Symmetry: D2
Subunit: 334 residues, 4 copies
């Protein structure tokens, strides 16, 4: 249906491309990075985390060919020169990691695009959306630069929503044991965050995160009630959220898990999932949901303080949410 362009064909860029292959409402016609079609084709075909792509992938001189279709490969460091209007691109997925500020992301619009989905927390965005939580707050007439938040926020918000609406959250704190990402370093290198400067595959690395705070963007009633941190560990993908919260209503572990399960099988199906299996991170690689409750970990003290643990494939779940968001925005009119 709607033509989409991907700026930054990396971990999210290529995983969003995979998800798009399954969505009839969106079609990727062009991708932009800092290399040649031959390199991008090779990366799209062989993935160290998700295995070989199940699709026809080859190179057509200067472009990529996936399942017969031809994808235009651009190599423009400056977004202002992407010329999206010339190839009919209406929605651009901004996933380079360098244009999270609206002043920069808006360049895609100047280039002919109509909507821009920043694949991460943004600065001065028209609106931040978490699919399954507040997409209804989207305004096709006033929202042009949209943020799909972080995958961590996408994992916490859905179950934070359930807990609050059913029991009411007084306050809480979270920690996400998160797989390392390309924002880190291989061997002790300069980084604004002296924690992230350290060898990623060698340590448990505490680092900041605004995921708990960002929840308020999508769930206003929780403004100022949540905070958190992250701990980057030596795994290449899949992360887990650990929330400890004080509730208003007196509850038991059974009632908490029951409510989470009902929501996973109800209105949040596909967004929130519920698992009573004693699994580990490798088990969620490839998971497409935004959040899967590890029911066995649910814990309660004095019937007021609760611990909820939820899994998430930070690359896959979020990538599918980006696609869902692209399709939703499209169904509202461009």
């Amino acid at each position: 249906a709607v033509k989409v362009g991907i700026n930054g064909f990396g971990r999210i860029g290529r995983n969003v491309f995979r998800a798009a292959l399954k969505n009839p409402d969106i079609e990727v016609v062009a991708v932009n990075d800092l290399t040649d079609a031959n390199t991008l084709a090779h990366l799209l075909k062989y993935d160290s985390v998700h295995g070989r792509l199940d699709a026809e992938v080859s190179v057509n001189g200067n472009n990529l060919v996936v399942n017969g279709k031809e994808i235009i490969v651009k190599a423009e460091r400056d977004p202002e020169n992407l010329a999206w209007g010339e190839i009919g691109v209406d929605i651009v997925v901004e996933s380079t990691g360098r244009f999270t500020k609206r002043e920069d992301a808006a360049k895609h619009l100047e280039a002919g695009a109509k909507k821009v989905i920043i694949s991460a927390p943004a600065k001065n965005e028209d609106i931040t959306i978490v699919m399954g939580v507040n997409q209804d707050k989207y305004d096709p007439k006033a929202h042009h630069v949209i943020s799909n938040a972080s995958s961590t926020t996408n994992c916490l918000a859905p179950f934070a929503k359930v807990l609050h609406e059913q029991f009411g959250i007084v306050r809480g704190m979270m920690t996400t044991v998160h797989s390392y990402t390309n924002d880190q370093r291989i061997l002790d290198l300069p980084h604004k965050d002296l924690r992230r400067a350290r060898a990623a595959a060698e340590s448990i690395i505490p680092t900041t995160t605004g995921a708990a705070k960002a929840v308020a963007l999508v769930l206003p009633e929780l403004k100022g009630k949540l905070n958190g941190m992250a701990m980057r560990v030596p795994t290449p993908n899949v992360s887990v959220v650990d929330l400890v919260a004080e509730l208003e209503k007196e509850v038991t572990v059974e009632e908490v898990n029951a409510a989470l399960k009902a929501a996973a099988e109800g209105e949040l199906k596909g967004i929130l999932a519920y698992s009573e299996e004693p699994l580990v991170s490798r088990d969620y690689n490839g998971s497409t949901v935004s959040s899967t409750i590890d029911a066995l970990s649910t814990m309660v003290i004095d019937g007021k303080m609760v611990k909820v643990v939820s899994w998430y494939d930070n690359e896959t779940g979020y990538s599918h949410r980006v696609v869902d968001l692209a399709a939703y925005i499209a169904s509202k009119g461009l």
Copy 2:
């Protein structure tokens, strides 16, 4: 001073041996395992985690020779046949992982020993001690099978003590992101804990832990107020405790860190430490304290809910505590 024997010359066994080398009050004269002196000597000399031992290590036919001294090497699967009385051993460090029940640990006494320190949570022990917290509760006349608890409990209790005495803990929950240990598995193998059965170096592995509950053993006032879980990750050593707690007194981050720092430089010096540095797990390898507060991570909401993060070398800190406990018990009379 007092002659000590080590049953199970593994990670804790050999690290306790290192610590003992620095303690004038204790002397290791014999070690028992399931192999030959040649293998134990090689393991004591080259350590994948802590580097080459700085000491003279060789083999004397059937025994080990460390810095001129000769250590008797035993290979008795059954503790009942250790004959500690024949070699003057008064205190035995039970660190095989197979004799945590008093009925089994007591065998060391039957063999001629006077005291037994189980290097882990135990069953029916005469008393569980956390150095710096409740060693005063030790009774030389009635306590013969002692548990030094877990390293996780040894990391949480000291700062749990401070928080409670200064602000009062209503209730709290913890999660320890812990390095993998030999209790896990290399590649998906049977294990009572289906979580721990999974490849240790490949996933983030949630697992049970009684560390939060065990705190009550050493801090009675906290009985039933704390619970927790663990998440085993792909690091070979060093772990971190993440405690979220509701306090009685209204506080600020500054006051919380101030109290922790004062205690680290005061009565808990050597047991509890305080760090304002943005470090990572590799930075604590070799740390001898039981708990080091990561001050930068301290967080507070509504002045009542607090998050305290503390580091610990699960092998080194605990091993030194085992030695401290051996010396303390000795100073009370055998």
Copy 3:
């Protein structure tokens, strides 16, 4: 058709089971290990290396149920008590790693089985076979305890055959950079091999191997012509053979590769593969062939010394070969 039993439902056992699902000629009716069906079913369903099993898995009573097919679960430590005959099991895959000596493997025959396939180099076996190299040497009348060799030998032998028959091998030496296995240790523990005693995921670990010499078992002409070693590294699966050999005929890189490619698409199709893609180990996880030539790495000096590098998923390839051998044996008559 032929009923098969698996003794040692571990890394190779389970992989064999999955491979068997593809061959309608062999039916796995029972498996034996040292745990309960609940545990074996859980391990079979979720694999840290190969992902989630694409089949229904449940536990019925004290047996496993895969896609509705019931599989008997035994938990007998002593092979003499397996009673294979009682359930019509004619072929047993011995993959415990504990019964490689014929006197032990032969216990399965005493228990009623007609043929035993030892999933590893053996001692006093009636014959060692490498599919695609010497299966024709199997003699149904005299061979009852068969060895399928090691995964390393299954990788080397096929292309070693091609090099010798096509160019003649004077002598050669190989090194296999191999993923760690359950024979190693998590954190420095006793082991007959002081090298494998060390933390598997923390070092490059040089270790010995008879894979180079075992090739002579299946290629008698190469007796005394090859030798080698292994280097275990921090990866959970997939390994690679690196052979340096002196050839008789003077050749060029193109010639050597042309021959290997010819054999891969010809006589060794399904056993030996040929790739001109610049891939890495993760790309071969799940590979069902015994050996894939990494053509880009082919090297020649003075037209006499050549280097050939070949990939192999040590768990999957060998396990599929095990099933091929079982079917082969059955077709020869039991």
Copy 4:
């Protein structure tokens, strides 16, 4: 005595700095990178691979202070603007990895330095040197931009020299199982080498290397006699050379080892080492020699083909060699 400047205060830069602390003949007075002193001081103080620096470290103004000695911190991306002459820097260690071509390295000379040591294989350098092999070929009058080669070449060359002079090398091929480096990628990213583009800590990664051919630069007699490759694996530091060579003289394993041991305790003392211990990579972290023979791995066939395996801490050994070379050059007159 001689004032030295380090350009690129990374893995090699910092290791060089630490090595320099041991040599009173060279004084590092300034370092340059792309960040601030606060960041460089933090990196120098806490190392994920080599531990905590055993020295006082602080930041005075905008400079570093190590054990009271002040070190100028520069942050100039363009070497022409380093003004080395202005601060009396005569020798510059070029370790950014960006200036291996002489036209770039020569910018340090334009800036006032008298000699430049490129910490890697170079292009159009006046001469490439491997301490203990060809330092005598350095000519103070004509050599201003010098290359210290690669760490792999520094490991191979020394024992290759011994084998050729003692037995004569017909031809050989090597493979270095090498730890990952900052030249690789965390998670599948663009890279000129499609192999190094892949997740460094997740695979065994075959890659090319000129180390085998570069040995000819320092051992002209071996021109056209050697070639090889590298295999990057999931370890943060320490690598190992695996050489398979055809010799002229017929020898035995004992002979080959006897010669290597003789050279290690003789002419190559401090450069080449000899070990008969069954060690693993972690045991060599911190090793200051360029090459340590793993004698237990020595292999011989037909008394003509030999396999020699040698260990090397790729960061430390080379960095110490860099300091040796700087002192050597200085002693030749500037």
